[PDB]
Symmetry: D2
Subunit: 225 residues, 4 copies
């Protein structure tokens, strides 16, 4: 399972979304150092382009294998191979936009395969997302909690706005291996710090190039117990 994810790994994705009515589809092509926690992947909007909303809200649909897990904090995601794993997410924007996606991860030919299917609705016509007034996400810390053999993630994220300020978004994810969790080693409560940046945009966001660095940790601070 460890011995299967490799010091350089590749991802191909297929995606199928609808946001405020607008159907679309995307693919991507990706690579990174999983054990160093880094990846970059190139995204296309194969159908539905150009999109009438800020691409940024989709940014986090495109990779939980590429988290740097230190020795002695179990990697739920790498362990889950060769079967793979699946996440379920709800994103709730402070202005009423709501997004829900289910993603399917798996491996084939030493190449990671993501199937995404998402559904966005109730985004205000006048608001920064439907106005394309977003300038990318702030770094974030996700807390992962073990629960029923899965992990539940929580994350308060914030999208940067033109003029300054931020649009806030709450994330709630459920991560579920497809191995039996009797064949797994669960971590405790732990934290994943990230910074996801757009590094290239083209043809009105129908081509987008993204980099993530993700590092996991236990809470380092001294107890009194």
């Amino acid at each position: 399972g460890e011995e299967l994810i490799k010091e350089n790994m590749h991802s191909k994705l297929y995606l199928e979304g609808s946001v405020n009515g607008h159907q679309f589809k995307c693919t991507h092509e990706g690579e990174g150092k999983p054990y160093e926690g880094t990846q970059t992947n190139r995204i296309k909007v194969v159908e539905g382009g150009p999109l009438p909303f800020a691409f940024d809200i989709l940014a986090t649909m495109f990779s939980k294998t590429f988290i740097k897990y230190p020795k002695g904090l179990p990697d739920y995601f790498k362990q889950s191979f060769p079967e793979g794993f699946t996440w379920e997410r709800v994103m709730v924007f402070e202005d009423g936009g709501v997004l829900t996606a289910t993603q399917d991860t798996s491996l084939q030919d030493g190449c990671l395969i993501y199937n995404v299917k998402l559904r966005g609705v109730n985004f205000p016509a006048n608001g920064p997302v439907m106005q394309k007034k977003t300038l990318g996400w702030e770094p974030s810390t996700e807390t992962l909690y073990p629960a029923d053999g899965g992990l539940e993630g929580r994350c308060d994220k914030a999208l940067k706005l033109v003029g300054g300020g931020h649009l806030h978004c709450n994330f709630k994810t459920t991560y579920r291996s497809k191995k039996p969790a009797t064949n797994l080693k669960m971590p405790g409560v732990h934290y994943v710090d990230r910074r996801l940046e757009r590094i290239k945009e083209a043809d009105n966001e129908t081509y987008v190039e993204q980099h993530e660095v993700a590092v996991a940790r236990y809470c380092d601070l001294p107890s009194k117990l």
Copy 2:
């Protein structure tokens, strides 16, 4: 165009907590009486590991009784029909989004639902199949540049005696140009959705809805 008797057909794809499924329905009703019954099959992914009640409202806005002075946004929209899109937020954290297309094809109402549900607690009246249908409800409809926005607090009755509350937000959007629709003011739709019959671990379900629109009749 919308006759005093109308038939509907429904195809539905969904996913709830990663469990994928499909349904279809054949429905019959009285668009101007505000009544209908429809016969639902789960045809992939059944039997379902959660209460089918949470999908009840996925399965018909053309069947609301609109009194004479109160413009009917749904019946007006034909022949080109309308769409809706909804979020349901349960008080225990489960969230469903859903999108719907309503069209009119050679006399029949055709419905197409895609939905996606996540974060339902595992234990968990929804996931432990401990629900006993919805209470009657009142939806408030607000015009909102050219579409309607609905707001509704609903509650599922529970095995044991309580209620699981759920907050609905929906956006109704006519495919017709807005200039060809008289827009209603703010109004209310009182409903009672009931389960008539179920068989084979909720893989077959019959539902009946009655639904009557009104202005606020209180004086001023």
Copy 3:
């Protein structure tokens, strides 16, 4: 029964919204069995307020609901000892209000004491920018729960410019009379129309009128 066809009410309210402190009082009258009342409200300390008074409108009387025959009136049965309510209002743009009240009866006058705390009201939103024009009429749903009633209500403020600011209400109503001395209603609905009738001096004098009528679901069944 101690609820007459005509009753008066007296209110004292103490409040903090985004850290701005204030107090109100009111004297009101209405017709309990017809479902109508008028309250004359003063902002007696901390005025004029830096926020839309409209958010406070629903803080000012459940005894005045018209209950039809065979729908138990939880609030009128609660006397002589009365009842309390606790409410959370969550606005769609982040404002949140918690509030609690006491309703009692002294010398046949209804007496309301209200405490409230409101926070996180955005500086550029319609509440703080004073852009609201009153509430839409509404339906509150009431559910029996372990001796009390849980109320649920999605509401909306009209805005300058035409749209609405939505608000979510969750209230718990608890009788001060032991519960087996009351007949509880099943699940039911309260239709309302609350309106501002007059105002003066930068929104520091307000009069409001409520009509409220309860009903069971009237639609046919099976």
Copy 4:
């Protein structure tokens, strides 16, 4: 600033949760530049409480955060005419607490005043049934806004039987003194561990230790 190696606090709190009025005070001591402190909390009135004390844990100290050099400390610059916070806490089972706080400095000593109001905590849920086992460690993201700060914090209470109960926190932090008499931080994080050390007499007496350390995002930026 005027905040010494060692500092004490006294605190007075009054509030209502699901109708139940109470009042609290703490005496306190700690080290503000290594961001640690202990607080000995007394339920003077309304004891014992029908609800879990844990839900008040965070009501009881923003100057005791360790800020590294190069990240402005809003709270230490915000003195002598100090600062305030207004918080909303939304538990996933429906409990909602609002609360507001005053932080002033009067002759060697930190003064805390808190008023809170909690409603809609379900009667059969862990808070009213007292099935909680403390808070998990947390991180707060703090954003500049109008020369104030907005804190956002997903937090979790350990439960009996092993689950968690989650609670969303939103807090506005506002200095009582103007700008510029003060430098603003950028978007930054505070990592925290709150621990109950000692409990007595059905939760009427309680000792809390907090370690709080701020940082910027430490990760590589490709832009």
